[PDB]
RNA sequence: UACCUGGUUGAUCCUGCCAGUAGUCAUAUGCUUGUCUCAAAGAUUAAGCCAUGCAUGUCUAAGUAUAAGCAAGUACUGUGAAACUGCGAAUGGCUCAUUAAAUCAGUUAUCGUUUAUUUGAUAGUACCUCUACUUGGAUAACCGUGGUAAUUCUAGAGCUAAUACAUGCUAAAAAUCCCGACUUUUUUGGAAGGGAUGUAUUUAUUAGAUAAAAAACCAAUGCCUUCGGGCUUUUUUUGGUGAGUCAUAAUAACUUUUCGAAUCGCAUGGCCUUGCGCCGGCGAUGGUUCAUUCAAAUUUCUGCCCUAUCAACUUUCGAUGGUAGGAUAGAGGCCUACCAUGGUUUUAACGGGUAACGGGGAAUUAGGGUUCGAUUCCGGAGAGGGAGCCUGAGAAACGGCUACCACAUCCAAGGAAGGCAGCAGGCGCGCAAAUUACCCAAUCCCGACACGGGGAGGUAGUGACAAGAAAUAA
RNA sequence: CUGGUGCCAGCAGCCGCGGUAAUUCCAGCUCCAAUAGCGUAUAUUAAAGUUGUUGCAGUUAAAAAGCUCGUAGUUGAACU
RNA sequence: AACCAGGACUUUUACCUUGAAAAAAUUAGAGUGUUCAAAGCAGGCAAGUUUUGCUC
RNA sequence: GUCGCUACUACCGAUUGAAUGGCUUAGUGAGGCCUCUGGAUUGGCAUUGCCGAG
């Protein structure tokens, strides 16, 4: 299979190292899991030492989190806006490490209705005084209205699909929401 | 060249065949080998054809047909006795055991019967270790929660001063 | 290569067992345990070569097999367990209470005690961390670990357990005027008394420790061993009390020994 | 080298693990002590790089050997080569010779690295195929 | 163990080499031979090719008995062929082909990693808002019976078992967070009753103060005094490392939901509603996590023969570095996309040769040095040359498999099948090197384990030589 | 020393002996050295101060570039 | 201000001394009746009791 | 010093030089592996769509 050795690699000097060993298994490599967007299709592996890893080729309703309330919950993956490096990753739809997707927000809407009360952009007694004591906060940014707005909300995955099976994320928001719309406002 | 239940190919043909399917038998774990087997499919080179009785005729086969086999063995588990004798709940289940005769055997006066043994069947044996590994559980918790305690008295003592 | 290895030659047998060079070709290779191999005694060494109780390797595995060493007060069956340092070996059978415990050259020797003294097993720490629950939790440097042990222990001390009834009931701290034995190296097995204690960046604490004669020498952090303090070590020391006997006095002792008979 | 804008990648060059909220104002920057008698520079401190391979502000830890040389290439990106000196033992003649050694360690942008300006360097895991050190300590000519 | 001599000339003194001289498990051969102790014996070319036998097997009362035997209590009750199951087979042993900062030697790091077994800790929590607590099916052997000339030749046909495989309540009680029937300030208004709340994965966030010591404001709100509003020794989590985002605790979600026992053998102890009901011991085998151990994998510095009639080498198709990703158990241009042109070198880079495995070490010995080191110890590589892969913690394993290349073999001409640089023995190359022997008794290893096995290992047969003692006299 | 051949056979590590008196050729006698061991062929080491850092030699025996500049390299006055 | 005690203390090396951790065998070499020796790591007491020990 | 005869040593050389082994160019490509498919057969559900697998 693929090696990971530097025997094969030129050294620093130069010079070509020739052959000393013949390929081990404890320096093998795999193939690339290029999860893209699909019916959820996780397999398993098994690695050295005894232990497994989750692969995955398709993910379906994956978690992403919102640390301004530090809330998180499930939510089902549309489609990958933009992912460093080959460009064309994004054309052939994989899903990595450090690539920002398209997400809805009809669980947010949802979750923040009942949790707030008073609806963004428009008896119970309890209910009432729960809002009340939980009103000023509810302010939030003006791209996270117009996502909600719009129906789609943009999020930056945190894990590696290919050795956790798992597609786990957080809402952008900040900075980095305006570095990336200005990354991604010329090119859309 | 044996049969092979899948092959679509009219003839014989060489396959990695695994021990998940027939034919195979592994000398050690882990291991595969590369072996000849014919189609599933019937043609005219075969020699012995395997056929089975569905449904018998009008006339009977004096060789087969006539001739029937016993069946010598019985039930073992506590369940297969159980359909197999359709007795009650509480009907004496060691009552329901097949007897053989040892006239063969050479045993002269006094055949002594021989009988296999029936398996899951509730004995009081089982339910002591049982009972033990209750008791082991119950202990680590006591000592869990006696040392526990005893911690809490130094940490309120490293606490307080 | 592609594995582990489970013969051990001899000649490569490490030189403290003193194992006699003929009389076969491969050494007792320890089994995996609570000491290192290179660092442990063997219960077939200990208990034929060392101690006499049967000869070759057959009698003594057959003893083993008759449940009679109470190794810790339990009984083993392996015939090449890693007995390490401060180890007992109660033969109830006997009555002897055997203590494995390095003499004034650096070698095991016959440390036999009383029936009390031979239950605590006074043992080094190695880390202090929390474990699950949030609790803290203890490592010595026999393989055993202590729930819930005192608040004031810190690295680099002192512990006596009590064994089958376990727990911790006494710790020694690490600081001036204790007494301590050097497990390995150059200076092996010989107790006297910290005094300096020398910092060095990154690793490598330098402990300087002067003898019952005031000789002085050095040795490393992980090599000391603290048993006792100003003159109260809580453990009985063998024979010649670890202090330095050299080649001049030994040759003295000798001539000695011979004006005897 | 030259210190360029921060975010001038693809990926968002950011501090990992480090969140902003309504509450606390702005991004907090951290901060850790190498070790070893170091002390971490002001401008890592309060700068602007975030520079992933450093031994402030960063991911790698400082353990093992701790050598010191003369860089000698400052052509390439945030790492140096550090030509170390020494005298070969001959036994037969009872004489030396010079022999030298070029390094290869990373240099933050805490550090401003020329020719000559000899630096002591540490060891700092393997880096980049032949980078197994990190710039810790510069005595330079200037000051 | 600081040593010489003969040879150029008619004769002399030098330079100079030749020769004599002495040593070497350093090799062979020639002549000769009555004994013991001790140690080695196909490396030098053919890491060339092999008929034949062996070298890896393993069971306690305690994983399965219906022996389809046996010697002698109506589920069996003693032996047990036969097999499945678990483990080892990655340890030993052989050889030195390849290998020139490669191996190896000394010295560091893994705060950049994995690990079967051993040791020590770890588990009143699984399901209902009607759940088995004891439960599914297949799977050997036996049984008739078939094809191939022989196969480690199997399927066809009846079944019966698992500490294998696949499911499945167990244990209370207390407490916590959410959904909310309800009133009447009886705080900021919380709870009747309903559910998750053990353990394990991933994601985000908070606390992670602690070298010590005073005040001005805002929010929810813990003790509420004596409702002015106070607000503390502490509930603010805590500890450790040279050094961290380290260990631990709290918050919000996910898991084709991990573990949390459907197993065996002996002591028949004690009870009263007397059911033949309750309860009580000594062990063994598995299983989650952590530490440790046995190992592995990378990795810092320094040290390698000859060659300039090799002076520039490396970047195409990775050569030097940055970002991001993939893969790996794990760092890393190991790989991919983009961005820069970099790295080494007269202190000899690079290329080539080596009749070069490296070292501990051996021979000679004033000292300095020179030569050798396949070989009883350590590390590396290989099992005809490559390449790929399953099993297994650990193999790119060859007494594991697969395909090509060069060989050998039975063929009925349809096919089948292998690897002694293991122990013996055969052919050939050869100046050059041994028995187709006995044994697990000693050293140790493997396994379910006092009981089995081990061409590892011990012993012996053969020699002219490797060392030590001495017949052929008196 | 005694017999056979007579630049022939041959001996011989080098010098070297043999053309009718051969202490060096082949036969006998005896003697010398080691000893159950001795010789021969090859590799290597000491001698080799003929590899020389210790520790060589360069006018005539082998050996100072025809001469000069010049960078690596080597060596570098005294004084705290 | 200033003083004493403990720790750190070479701007930066080369050099010299000592210590630490460091495989054994092998080399030198200490002890020790394989009849000496190549060896090996044991071994010894103790003639008048035989002692179910001591000593290295 | 040229010419000699011989045993033997070394060099160049037409033959667009031959015969092995590494280093590379171009073409093709066995083999196992990862992945996309395919549901004889096992099928619980006169029935008939759903859990499924090698």
Not at chain 2, 63 to 66: N, S, Y
Not at chain 3, 11 to 28: F, I, M, N, Q, R
């Given at each position: 299979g693929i090696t990971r050795d530097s025997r094969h690699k030129r050294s620093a000097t130069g010079a070509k190292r020739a052959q000393y060993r013949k390929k081990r298994k404890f320096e093998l490599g795999r193939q690339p899991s290029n999860t893209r967007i699909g019916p959820k299709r996780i397999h398993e592996v098994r690695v050295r030492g005894g232990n497994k890893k989750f692969r995955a080729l398709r993910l379906d309703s994956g978690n992403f989190s919102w640390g301004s309330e530090g809330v998180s919950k499930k939510t089902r993956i549309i489609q990958v806006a933009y992912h460093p490096s080959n460009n064309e990753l994004v054309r052939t739809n994989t899903l990595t490490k450090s690539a920002i997707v398209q997400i809805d927000a009809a669980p947010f809407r949802v979750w923040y209705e009942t949790h707030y009360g008073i609806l963004m952009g428009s008896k119970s007694k309890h209910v009432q005084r729960k809002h009340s004591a939980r009103l000023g906060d509810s302010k939030v940014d003006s791209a996270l209205e117009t996502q909600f707005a719009a129906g789609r909300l943009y999020a930056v995955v945190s894990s590696r699909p290919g050795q956790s099976g798992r597609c786990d994320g957080y809402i952008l928001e900040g900075e980095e929401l305006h570095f990336y719309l200005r990354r991604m406002a010329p090119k859309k | 060249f044996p049969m092979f239940q899948?092959?679509?190919?009219p003839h014989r043909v060489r396959l990695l065949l695994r021990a998940g399917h027939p034919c195979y038998r592994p000398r050690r774990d882990g291991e595969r080998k590369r072996k000849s087997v014919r189609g599933c499919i019937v043609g005219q080179d075969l020699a012995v054809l395997a056929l089975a009785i569905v449904k018998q005729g009008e006339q009977d086969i004096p060789?087969?047909?006539?001739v029937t086999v016993p069946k010598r063995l019985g039930p073992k588990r506590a369940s297969k006795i159980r359909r197999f004798f359709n007795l009650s709940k509480e009907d004496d289940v060691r009552q329901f055991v097949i007897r053989r005769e040892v006239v063969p055997k050479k045993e002269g006066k006094k055949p002594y019967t021989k009988a296999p043994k029936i398996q899951r069947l509730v004995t009081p044996r089982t339910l002591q270790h049982k009972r033990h590994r209750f008791a082991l559980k119950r202990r680590q918790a006591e000592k869990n929660r006696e040392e526990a305690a005893e911690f809490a008295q130094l940490m309120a003592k490293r606490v307080a001063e | 290569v592609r594995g582990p290895k489970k013969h051990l030659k001899r000649?490569?047998?490490?030189?403290?067992?003193?194992?006699?060079?003929?009389?076969?070709?491969?050494?007792?290779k320890p089994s995996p345990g609570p000491h290192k191999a290179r660092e442990c005694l063997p219960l077939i060494v200990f208990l034929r070569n060392r101690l006499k109780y049967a000869l070759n390797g057959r009698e003594v595995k057959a003893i083993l097999m008759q449940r009679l060493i109470k190794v810790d007060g339990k009984v083993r069956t392996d015939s090449t367990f890693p007995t390490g340092f401060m180890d007992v070996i109660s033969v109830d059978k006997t009555g002897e209470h055997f203590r494995l415990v390095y003499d004034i050259k650096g070698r095991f020797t016959v440390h036999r005690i009383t029936a009390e003294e031979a239950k605590y097993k006074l043992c080094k720490v190695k880390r202090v961390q929390l474990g699950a629950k949030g609790v803290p939790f203890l490592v010595t440097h026999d393989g055993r670990t202590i729930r819930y042990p005192d608040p004031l222990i810190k690295v680099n001390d002192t512990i006596k357990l009590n064994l089958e009834t376990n727990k911790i009931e006494s710790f020694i701290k690490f600081d001036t005027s204790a007494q301590v034995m050097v497990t390995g190296g150059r200076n092996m097995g010989r107790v006297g008394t910290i005094v300096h204690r020398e910092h060095h960046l990154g690793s490598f604490e330098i402990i300087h420790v002067k003898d019952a004669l005031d000789r002085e020498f050095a040795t490393r952090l992980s090599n000391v061993f603290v048993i006792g303090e100003t003159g109260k070590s809580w453990i009985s020391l063998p024979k010649g009390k670890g202090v330095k006997l050299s080649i001049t006095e030994e040759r003295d002792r000798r001539r000695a020994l011979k004006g005897l008979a | 080298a030259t210190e360029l804008v921060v975010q001038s990648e693809r990926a968002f060059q950011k501090q990992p693990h480090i969140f902003q909220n309504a509450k606390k104002g702005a991004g907090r920057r951290w901060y850790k002590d190498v070790g070893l008698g170091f002390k971490t520079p002001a401008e890592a401190i309060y700068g602007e790089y975030v520079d992933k391979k450093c031994p402030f502000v960063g991911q790698v830890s400082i353990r093992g050997r701790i050598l010191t040389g003369t860089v000698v290439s400052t052509k390439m990106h945030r790492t140096i080569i550090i030509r170390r000196e020494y005298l070969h033992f001959i036994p037969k003649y009872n004489r030396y010779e010079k022999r030298h050694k070029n390094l290869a360690a990373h240099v933050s942008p805490a550090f401003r690295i020329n020719e000559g300006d000899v630096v002591t360097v540490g060891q700092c895991r393997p880096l980049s195929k032949t980078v197994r050190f990190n710039v810790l300590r510069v005595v330079k000519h200037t000051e």
């Open positions: - | 899948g092959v679509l190919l060789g087969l047909t006539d | 000649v490569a047998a490490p030189h403290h067992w003193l194992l006699d060079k003929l009389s076969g070709t491969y050494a007792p | -």
